[PDB]
């Protein structure tokens, strides 16, 4: 035990047609990836191909058929949770934070669509993120994520470590284990649940304008319990697990094989329930987009200003080939001041294939005026705002948000992230409210 | 078949206690009471005494615990329905007029106080009213309900006739069998019910107040259907019936003996699950108060204005001599303008005896000014808000209320009742709402 | 000593919907009480508002169950008194009948291992056809208190149409009592075994039925330890039924669904599911015109007489709509006539596509006719055809739906005044041989 | 080719509940790993802040179970792998033991008609106990993953504190999957007798078996035609449990609770239940002091030495506030010796006042060491011991619990890296007669 744990390499073989596919996708160039010796990601691949799974086929084929009502506009998708997952703070309080955190959202946002909410933390595996430069602001190699390299400000620990790949899955299958843990526990009670916002309700200094809302919610909450319904739902509390899919090595690595009570048998990325591909790795003929093809877990796509109606369409045919509606999440990152002129015109190219597809709004990765990298909540708000009218308009459903939050209240001061400064817990319960409101009118 | 259907008379014994209790009860003088041959009355009564009862003891006594957490202040009572049931609208349309009257106020009420609310209409049996004078208005014998004489305006139909004591019974064994379908089927879908509230709201012209109120109740409805709670209550819907305890021929030929997995065996009045005691016939050695103590149902009793809480402590203590939480209602009739003056040292007095009754409010009985029999409504709510005032300052229960309405529309023009000018179905419907507000504040 | 008790028609129903009604009553009728028109008259009219016995989403759900029953997944238990009489139509009588039909519900639902539809010859059996028009003491046959008195005396016997109200106050007092109970602890699964169990140490015949009767014990703790809810399940759902005889009566009765569901379509509500009996089955008579007309699950009885060509034509006047579980053909033929007679009726009804309910019916089509004066039934036979019903379908690989039976809570053996059948430890103890049929 | 992997702490725990603590471990500890002090330190920090493989709402929920199972309304089943390997610690495996385990549940729960509480002996049993320092090769004998490699090499054997770490990996990604699986259609009642309906079909001892797993069929079915809710139900809670052995890991686990109930009190997270061995339950060595201050439900291993006296002691040094089902005495005498050494201890222990529940472990106690060079344990004197288990308690009127058992998923017979056992079809050959031991 020479500072550091030491794991043993391991010293039922795929149908020939997923074998072909699962090769031919992972053939084509892929965006992002890291850069280290192929010879030690295999020995990585190894280890992980045969570990327990973080998730199960079953409920990933659950989280479709909720997805669907989602996308069916009689649900709503609220997926949230870290900006950037951390080793270092992979513990029982900062876990219980996200998902007191996520949870808190959920009760506001379903007493205001007055329809269920899917909950999506981002967790278990949202350890891995792209950028743009290579080299960044102190001239080091950028950091890429606790699975890649270090958040340590220095070119040691930026080198890019394949046994990383490993080090990020016993954390994500430990958090996932708490996750199961505690919603399965009373932290998931409906009530215990809504005191803390009743709470929030009278410390915050801006609580007034809540006050309100918060209190009718309470009173729906009270009048269930009147109408004679035990907590014996009631459904047990549900958080599905979700990550970008950016390292082809650790997603391929998870991937499983289903055994056939669902039609024929298919490969399941098992790294999670849901996964979605980013701006910068969504390539259309790209190994990200072609490895979506393959499995079959829900897969959600972000679309920036530059998307255009008929590439939206073309990742609606591909992503989404059997049309089951839900299967495919198109993520709309405009920018308050662009989203409005933006999105109309890919709503109805897209609605007009016959396909439903969940209209999720990210209000987040749009809006950065770089003060740090400084984001004004006013300009977040004023997204998803602007997310909701074009819906509204057009008729279609607006299907859900994207939030990157977090448990500890952050901001000089307060910054915390090993990323960007987001919402803080307090503005995203915050910013529940006034979607709320949205879905109301 | 001569005009009249004939029905023909009957050719184990009692716990020689309450054969004894019994006798001495009804051996003590009794108001009110018809004035027919006893040797006529004696058949009846024995035809009546080995019919199908209209409710069964396990009812009586899930309704007993029901009323205790009332009692307790965990629950409300609604009780309310006709003023005075007639044989000649005992139809299926009133009847599930007065259930839909009876649950539309359910729901609101419920909503309000943020707890159950117990359903008892005024139903299957409430056929006999006390008078005051023997001849009344036109110089005929007083029309005293279905069960004792008839509404028709001439001598012959007014005189008092036993045969209605059976007659009686067919009806309102007839009228129970109804209800216990209607409440059982969808009729009593709590969305099927608040669909009807959120009707009267936009076809009201006094609905502009309620648009609110019924809005958020709706809210509090969708978001239970949203938090995953199938209809599948829910518990299933229930009507209790009660009538006023006066004619004794009828209420003790309705007498069954409990068979003793409940302690020990005991008289149960199966003509009702609660029945309760009227102004003009509480005298505190009477028969009717010997009669409550007899039985093992829930008994209400009226407090009118000269009642003293010294008295009104002497009926807690012989009708609920065990402390047994609800199985006592004391009913206040007061008038808006005494209410307040004359309740408050009743309930100090009573409370301090160590009992628990149901404080349930009758605005209803104390208030008419006589314009017909006129009651202006604002006199109405005024009483049930200073009937409020009252426990709100001394830090009591208000139970829950008392009303006398309809389901079709009555006001000259339509004065359909057999008796007194009520609430109407909209009134009273207006009236949960107006009450509504009062619980939440 | 008796007590004569006197008495605004509401909205007629529908002009259109009275006109096919008409239409259908204008045939001849069988078996009809010989009362005058205008006093059956004034009696229709009362009927004619007050409170039904039955609601329509009741039946709408029936009917639901019934298709299961149909379709191979349920069983039908029908079962209750041979004559309801106004004067034991008391509270023990009700509770008793109820009791041994749960009782009886238990073991057969264990046995076929499929959800028992339970329905019960209440609140309505007050009628009966007779082949005899002068009776054995030289009187006017007695024909059902719904038409007139079992008292051997001339006056008693002529039928009286206020007979008509005072069968509907009873049927409708004693559907407010079964509502009561089986809503209560009375159909309490536990509750309702406890009694069966008693009846294994307590009966001659136990030792043949406690090997069964633990088993349907420890299936009843099983899934208690596995923490099942009590608070089902459905309570106990008992449905009311009665052969539909006297017409003016089932007429008086018809009411119109209000059509938030579906149209509007006409029910009787004097019972939920109403059967035609052998004598009045005519095919284009009164009796089969009126299944026709009203909405509710309907059944029919087949006798000995039955050819295979005319239960077709039921089939196609009765489900024309072919609603799975709509019509329940009746089987009542005879232990020994059953297995030959049987068959070819299946067969020939099967093939139209239609999917009728087969129940068995082995109380009529078995009856001896004692040696000491006292009309009589034997068990063996009634089994018998039990089982041979169940052996004609096996063979041909249809369903045996359910069970008619005339049984009682009480113990008795002669205090019935009507036909001779079972008792509530004989019923009891059908339930049981009927349950071993199911499990093979 | 292996692979290192490098490596903030939180608050501590309180200062109070610490001194009680470093006052507990200061006893002398038996059958502990001999590595360095200071990096055993380093490696508890780590899991010091790690998440916990349990929470405490589960633990107080558990208890509340055990103590029905020890008020005899309830039994308990606890069984897995004899020792957990990190290299078999795969998803096969798993969810093999998960449905041994369900498969038994099933049978023994029919068999009770009680709930049974399942606990697995999962996600954490890493370590065991070795009366050989040196072993037959010659080499620093195998202590279980958690401490050593089972390569019979000399540095493979050596005892390195990373699989402290390692050992918590396995142990949460374990129980991830139990969760996982636990909460989907592989504890679905229906679904898993299934896999007994066909062992009854494809076993050679299956003519003896299939008429119970008839009946426990019917009342599967019985309860579905009742229309009960599948959707329990309670889905089917599994808990995790280990041996407490190597004390460095438990301790490291130790969390407080955030006492929204109760006060607060420590918990041992690295599971659910645990237990203390036949070589380390020394009354005044660490590992009872252990047991004492945290509030996990305890039990342990009662072996063929055990005087009621010293049975007595451990009855007060654990239980001392009688909270019923806290501790559980487990019983490995031995067949022939179980029936003679059994009783006095019950009666002196039932004596005392307290509840303990009553476990038979049948496994350690009978082995014979056979004949061909493997090891290994014969299975009629297996279920003798839970025979005679079952017959001393009747005797005394006293409740038998449950059973402890080492099984497998996997057909084996010598795949194990550990003591020999039962297989998949052996356990599960072994609920079924453990089954008819509780009818009677
Ligand atoms: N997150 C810490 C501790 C840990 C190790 C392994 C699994 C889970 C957590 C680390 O990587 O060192
Ligand atoms: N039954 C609710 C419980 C819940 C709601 C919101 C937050 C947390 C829990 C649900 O599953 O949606
Ligand atoms: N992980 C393998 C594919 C695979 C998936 C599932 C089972 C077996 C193999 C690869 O990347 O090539
Ligand atoms: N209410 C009517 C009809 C009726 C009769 C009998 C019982 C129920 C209703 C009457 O008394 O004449
Ligand atoms: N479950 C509700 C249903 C209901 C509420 C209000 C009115 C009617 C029905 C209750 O029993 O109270
Ligand atoms: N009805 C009887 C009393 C009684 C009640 C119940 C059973 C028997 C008798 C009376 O008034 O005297
Ligand atoms: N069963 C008696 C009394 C009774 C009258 C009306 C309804 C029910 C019962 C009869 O019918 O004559
Ligand atoms: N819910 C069960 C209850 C029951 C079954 C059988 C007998 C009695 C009661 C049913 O209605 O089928
Ligand atoms: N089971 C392998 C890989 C693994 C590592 C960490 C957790 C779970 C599994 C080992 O422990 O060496
Ligand atoms: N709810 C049952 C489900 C179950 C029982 C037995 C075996 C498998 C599943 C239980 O947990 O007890």
Not at 70 to 99: S, Y
Not at 195 to 212: C, H, K, L, Q
């Amino acid at each position: 035990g020479a500072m550091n744990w030491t794991v043993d390499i391991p010293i039922p073989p795929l149908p020939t047609d997923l074998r072909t596919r699962l090769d031919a996708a992972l053939a084509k160039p892929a965006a992002q990836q890291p850069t280290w010796p192929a010879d030690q990601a295999l020995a990585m691949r190894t280890v992980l191909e045969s570990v327990p799974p973080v998730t199960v086929p079953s409920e990933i084929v659950r989280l479709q058929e909720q997805l669907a009502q989602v996308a069916k506009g009689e649900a709503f998708l609220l997926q949230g949770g870290d900006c950037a997952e951390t080793f270092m703070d992979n513990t029982e309080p900062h876990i219980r934070g996200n998902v007191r955190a996520l949870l808190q959202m959920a009760v506001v946002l379903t007493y205001g669509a007055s329809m269920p909410v899917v909950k999506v933390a981002r967790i278990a595996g949202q350890y891995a993120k792209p950028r743009s430069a290579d080299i960044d602001a102190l001239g080091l190699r950028s950091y890429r994520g606790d699975m890649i390299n270090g958040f340590a400000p220095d070119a040691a620990a930026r080198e890019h470590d394949p046994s990383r790949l490993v080090r990020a899955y016993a954390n994500a299958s430990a958090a996932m284990n708490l996750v199961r843990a505690l919603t399965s526990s009373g932290l998931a009670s409906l009530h215990l649940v809504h005191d803390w916002n009743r709470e929030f309700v009278r410390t915050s200094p801006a609580g007034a304008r809540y006050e309100a809302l918060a209190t009718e919610i309470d009173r729906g909450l009270r009048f269930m319990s009147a109408c004679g319904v035990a907590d014996r739902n009631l459904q047990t509390a549900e958080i599905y697990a979700s990550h970008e899919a950016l390292v082809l090595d650790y997603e391929r690595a998870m991937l499983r094989l289903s055994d056939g009570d669902d039609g024929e048998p298919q490969l399941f990325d098992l790294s999670a329930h849901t996964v979605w591909i980013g701006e910068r790795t969504r390539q259309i003929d790209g190994a990200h987009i072609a490895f979506a093809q393959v499995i079959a877990n829900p897969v959600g796509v972000k679309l920036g200003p530059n998307m255009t109606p008929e590439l939206a369409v073309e990742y609606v045919e591909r992503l989404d080939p059997h049309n089951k509606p839900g299967r495919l999440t198109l993520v709309s990152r405009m920018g308050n001041h662009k989203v409005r002129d933006l999105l109309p015109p890919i709503v109805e190219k897209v609605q007009a294939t016959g396909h439903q597809v969940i209209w999720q709004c990210d209000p987040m990765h749009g809006n950065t005026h770089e003060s740090f990298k400084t984001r004004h909540f006013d300009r977040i708000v004023d997204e998803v705002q602007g997310f909701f009218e074009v819906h509204r308009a057009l008729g279609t459903h607006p299907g859900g948000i994207h939030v990157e939050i977090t448990g500890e209240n952050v901001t000089a001061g307060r910054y915390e992230t090993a990323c960007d400064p987001r919402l803080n817990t307090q503005q995203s319960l915050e910013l529940a409210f006034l979607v709320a409101e949205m879905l109301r009118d």
